[PDB]
Design a protein around this motif. Structure first.
Motif, PDB file in Angstrom:
ATOM      1  N   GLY A  44       4.733   8.803   3.489  1.00 15.73           N
ATOM      2  CA  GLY A  44       3.915   9.632   4.369  1.00 15.73           C
ATOM      3  C   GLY A  44       2.788   8.953   5.137  1.00 15.73           C
ATOM      4  O   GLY A  44       2.264   7.939   4.662  1.00 15.73           O
ATOM      5  N   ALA A  89       3.218  -0.653  11.089  1.00 10.44           N
ATOM      6  CA  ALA A  89       3.271   0.803  11.097  1.00 10.44           C
ATOM      7  C   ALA A  89       2.572   1.212  12.415  1.00 10.44           C
ATOM      8  O   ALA A  89       1.521   0.659  12.726  1.00 10.44           O
ATOM      9  CB  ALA A  89       2.524   1.373   9.898  1.00 10.44           C
ATOM     10  N   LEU A 109      -6.929  -2.436  11.968  1.00 10.94           N
ATOM     11  CA  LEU A 109      -6.168  -2.228  13.195  1.00 10.94           C
ATOM     12  C   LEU A 109      -5.687  -3.566  13.798  1.00 10.94           C
ATOM     13  O   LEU A 109      -6.500  -4.463  14.052  1.00 10.94           O
ATOM     14  CB  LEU A 109      -7.083  -1.485  14.172  1.00 10.94           C
ATOM     15  CG  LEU A 109      -6.496  -0.522  15.176  1.00 10.94           C
ATOM     16  CD1 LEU A 109      -5.752   0.589  14.513  1.00 10.94           C
ATOM     17  CD2 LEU A 109      -7.602   0.100  15.960  1.00 10.94           C
ATOM     18  N   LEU A 163      -1.608   3.351  17.657  1.00 12.30           N
ATOM     19  CA  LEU A 163      -2.399   2.576  16.730  1.00 12.30           C
ATOM     20  C   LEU A 163      -1.469   1.797  15.863  1.00 12.30           C
ATOM     21  O   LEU A 163      -0.570   2.365  15.240  1.00 12.30           O
ATOM     22  CB  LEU A 163      -3.267   3.495  15.856  1.00 12.30           C
ATOM     23  CG  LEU A 163      -4.223   4.466  16.512  1.00 12.30           C
ATOM     24  CD1 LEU A 163      -5.004   5.187  15.446  1.00 12.30           C
ATOM     25  CD2 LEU A 163      -5.190   3.759  17.419  1.00 12.30           C
ATOM     26  N   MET A 180      -0.956  -0.969  12.710  1.00 11.87           N
ATOM     27  CA  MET A 180      -1.498  -1.518  11.469  1.00 11.87           C
ATOM     28  C   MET A 180      -0.364  -2.202  10.699  1.00 11.87           C
ATOM     29  O   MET A 180       0.801  -2.070  11.062  1.00 11.87           O
ATOM     30  CB  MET A 180      -2.184  -0.400  10.630  1.00 11.87           C
ATOM     31  CG  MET A 180      -1.236   0.380   9.721  1.00 11.87           C
ATOM     32  SD  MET A 180      -2.012   1.474   8.495  1.00 11.87           S
ATOM     33  CE  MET A 180      -2.295   0.347   7.130  1.00 11.87           C
ATOM     34  N   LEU A 191       2.330  -2.722   7.868  1.00 11.40           N
ATOM     35  CA  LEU A 191       3.208  -1.773   7.205  1.00 11.40           C
ATOM     36  C   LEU A 191       3.038  -1.908   5.703  1.00 11.40           C
ATOM     37  O   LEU A 191       3.179  -3.001   5.162  1.00 11.40           O
ATOM     38  CB  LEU A 191       4.670  -2.044   7.590  1.00 11.40           C
ATOM     39  CG  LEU A 191       5.731  -1.111   6.990  1.00 11.40           C
ATOM     40  CD1 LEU A 191       5.591   0.327   7.528  1.00 11.40           C
ATOM     41  CD2 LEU A 191       7.129  -1.643   7.301  1.00 11.40           C
ATOM     42  N   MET A 192       2.702  -0.792   5.047  1.00 10.62           N
ATOM     43  CA  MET A 192       2.557  -0.684   3.610  1.00 10.62           C
ATOM     44  C   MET A 192       3.885  -0.138   3.064  1.00 10.62           C
ATOM     45  O   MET A 192       4.813   0.070   3.851  1.00 10.62           O
ATOM     46  CB  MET A 192       1.343   0.192   3.248  1.00 10.62           C
ATOM     47  CG  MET A 192       0.072  -0.280   3.934  1.00 10.62           C
ATOM     48  SD  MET A 192      -0.564  -1.835   3.254  1.00 10.62           S
ATOM     49  CE  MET A 192      -1.438  -1.227   1.809  1.00 10.62           C
ATOM     50  N   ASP A 193       4.003   0.051   1.741  1.00 13.71           N
ATOM     51  CA  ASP A 193       5.280   0.474   1.170  1.00 13.71           C
ATOM     52  C   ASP A 193       5.354   1.924   0.730  1.00 13.71           C
ATOM     53  O   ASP A 193       6.463   2.447   0.564  1.00 13.71           O
ATOM     54  CB  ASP A 193       5.663  -0.448   0.010  1.00 13.71           C
ATOM     55  CG  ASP A 193       5.841  -1.904   0.412  1.00 13.71           C
ATOM     56  OD1 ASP A 193       6.601  -2.166   1.358  1.00 13.71           O
ATOM     57  OD2 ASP A 193       5.257  -2.784  -0.261  1.00 13.71           O
ATOM     58  N   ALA A 194       4.198   2.571   0.509  1.00 14.57           N
ATOM     59  CA  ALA A 194       4.135   3.949  -0.007  1.00 14.57           C
ATOM     60  C   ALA A 194       2.775   4.519   0.177  1.00 14.57           C
ATOM     61  O   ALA A 194       1.811   3.763   0.299  1.00 14.57           O
ATOM     62  CB  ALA A 194       4.442   3.937  -1.518  1.00 14.57           C
ATOM     63  N   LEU A 250      -6.873   4.892   4.632  1.00 17.99           N
ATOM     64  CA  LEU A 250      -6.460   5.044   6.049  1.00 17.99           C
ATOM     65  C   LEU A 250      -7.435   5.711   6.987  1.00 17.99           C
ATOM     66  O   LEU A 250      -7.297   5.540   8.189  1.00 17.99           O
ATOM     67  CB  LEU A 250      -5.120   5.811   6.172  1.00 17.99           C
ATOM     68  CG  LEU A 250      -3.840   5.163   5.653  1.00 17.99           C
ATOM     69  CD1 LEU A 250      -2.649   6.073   5.915  1.00 17.99           C
ATOM     70  CD2 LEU A 250      -3.588   3.833   6.330  1.00 17.99           C
TER      71      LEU A 250
END
Ligand SMILES: Cc1ccc(NC(=O)Nc2cnn(-c3cccc(C(=O)Nc4ccnc(C)c4)c3)c2)cc1
Length: 350
Positions: free
Chosen positions: A29, A47, A82, A100, A102, A104-107, A162
Motif C-alpha cells: 500500500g 516508487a 525525494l 513524486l 522515491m 522503492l520499499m518492499d511493504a 512517508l
C-alpha cells in the motif's frame, strides 16, 4: 522529441519521464496513486506517486504544498527522501498533476504487523520509528497522525515514515470523496482536542507496538465516541489532574461517561503473545510490556517522552556510535484554487 510517455495503470493514466520503465501498481500500500518502476538513469527501482489536481480543494492543496516543501528541507534515513519531482504539463495554466519519486520499499507496516516477529525485528522497527519521530520533532514537526499505512519497510528491516502528519496552526476541511480516514492511532489529546507536545506521537507508536503484539487494532471505532470507549474500557478512566486540562464541554462528556477500573498490562498483553522458549525472550517480553505500559498512557504528562523511549532497555540496544549525522551529504493560511495551483507549481519548478 517528447520527454514523457503515458501508461494506463489500474484506473489512472501515468504520464512519466521516459527514464521510468515497467510501471506496476503497488495497491497495498497505497492507496494513493502509487506505482513501482525501474529508473534507467539511476539503474535502480523507484516508487512513483501521482497527485491528481492537488489544488482541487484546500485539504489536498495544503497537504501537497506542505509535504512538497518539507520533503525538500528534511533529511533523515528514517524519513521519506525525494529522488525526483515533475509535472508532464508545460505551463502554469496547463498544470494538472504532480509526480513524486522515491526509493522503492518492499511493504507497508500493516503487512509487517500481520507477521509473527522476533524481538530483534520488533525493537529495530520501533527504534527506527523513534529516530524518525525524534528527527521530525527537532525540526519543529509534531506529526499527530502516525499510522502503519504511511510507514514502509524494506526486507533488510529498514524503515521510513512517508508523511508529515496534521496541519500545524490548522484546521481541517470537508472532503467530497469516497475514502476513509484512519483515526485509531490518534492520541487522546487529538481525540479530545486538547493541545499537545512532542510525546503525542508516542501514543501512535504504542498503538503500533501493541498491535504488532496483539495482531488486532487496539482502539477501533466508527468515530471518536466508540474509539474513546475502547481506550477507557482497556486503560481505565484517567485521573482527575488530566481531566482538569480538558475544555469545559469535553470535560463534561468524559466525566459523564461510565467509569472503568482498567485492565493491567499483563492482562492487556498476556505472556502468551510473546515467545517463552528462552531466558533471552523471557527478559525481552517483560521489557516490551514495560515500554507499552509507558506509551499507552492517556495522560500526556504521565506518558513517556521520545528520548526516554529511546533510552529504554528494550530499544537502547540499537544505539549506534559514529552514525550521526548522515553519510550521503511557511505557510498555513487560507488560499484559493488558483493561488494554491501557483504555489504548488513554483514548488514543482523550484
Ligand atoms: C514520494 C512518495 C512516493 C510514494 C509514496 N507512497 C508509497 O506508498 N511509497 C512506497 C514505496 N514503496 N512502497 C511499497 C509498499 C508496499 C509494497 C511495495 C512493493 O511491492 N515493492 C516492490 C515491488 C517490486 N519489487 C521490489 C523489490 C519491491 C512497495 C510504497 C509516498 C511518497
Amino acid at each position: 522529441d517528447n520527454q514523457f510517455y503515458s501508461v494506463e495503470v489500474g484506473d489512472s493514466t501515468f504520464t512519466v519521464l521516459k527514464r521510468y520503465q515497467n510501471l506496476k501498481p503497488i495497491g497495498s500500500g497505497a492507496q494513493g496513486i502509487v506505482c513501482a518502476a525501474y529508473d534507467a538513469v539511476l539503474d535502480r527501482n523507484v516508487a512513483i506517486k501521482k497527485l491528481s489536481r492537488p489544488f482541487q480543494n484546500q485539504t489536498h492543496a495544503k497537504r501537497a504544498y506542505r509535504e512538497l516543501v518539507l520533503m525538500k528541507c528534511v533529511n533523515h534515513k528514517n524519513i521519506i527522501s525525494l529522488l525526483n519531482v515533475f509535472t508532464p504539463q508545460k505551463t502554469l495554466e496547463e498544470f494538472q498533476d504532480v509526480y513524486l519519486v522515491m526509493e522503492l520499499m518492499d511493504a507497508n507496516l500493516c503487512q509487517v504487523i500481520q507477521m509473527e516477529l522476533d524481538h530483534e525485528r520488533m525493537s529495530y522497527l520501533l527504534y527506527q520509528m523513534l529516530c524518525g519521530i525524534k528527527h521530525l520533532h527537532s525540526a519543529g514537526i509534531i506529526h499527530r497522525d502516525l499510522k502503519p499505512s504511511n510507514i514502509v519497510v524494506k526486507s533488510d528491516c529498514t524503515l521510513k515514515i512517508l508523511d508529515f502528519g496534521l496541519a500545524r496552526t490548522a484546521g481541517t476541511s470537508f472532503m467530497m470523496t469516497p475514502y476513509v480516514v484512519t483515526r485509531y492511532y490518534r492520541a487522546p489529546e487529538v481525540i479530545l482536542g486538547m493541545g499537545y507536545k512532542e510525546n503525542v506521537d508516542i501514543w501512535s507508536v504504542g498503538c503500533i507496538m501493541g498491535e504488532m503484539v496483539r495482531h488486532k487494532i487496539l482502539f477501533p471505532g466508527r468515530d471518536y465516541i466508540d474509539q474513546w470507549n475502547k481506550v477507557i474500557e482497556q486503560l481505565g478512566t484517567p485521573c482527575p489532574e488530566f481531566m482538569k486540562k480538558l475544555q469545559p464541554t469535553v470535560r463534561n462528556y468524559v466525566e459523564n461517561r461510565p467509569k472503568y477500573a482498567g485492565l493491567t498490562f499483563p492482562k492487556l498483553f498476556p505472556d502468551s503473545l510473546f515467545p517463552a522458549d528462552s531466558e533471552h525472550n523471557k527478559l525481552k517480553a517483560s521489557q516490551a510490556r514495560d515500554l507499552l505500559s509507558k506509551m499507552l498512557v492517556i495522560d500526556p504528562a504521565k506518558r513517556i517522552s521520545v528520548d526516554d523511549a529511546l533510552q529504554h532497555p528494550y530499544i537502547n540496544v540499537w544505539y549506534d556510535p559514529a552514525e550521526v549525522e548522515a553519510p550521503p551529504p511557511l505557510d498555513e493560511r487560507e488560499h484559493t484554487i488558483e493561488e494554491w495551483k501557483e504555489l504548488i507549481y513554483k514548488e514543482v519548478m523550484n
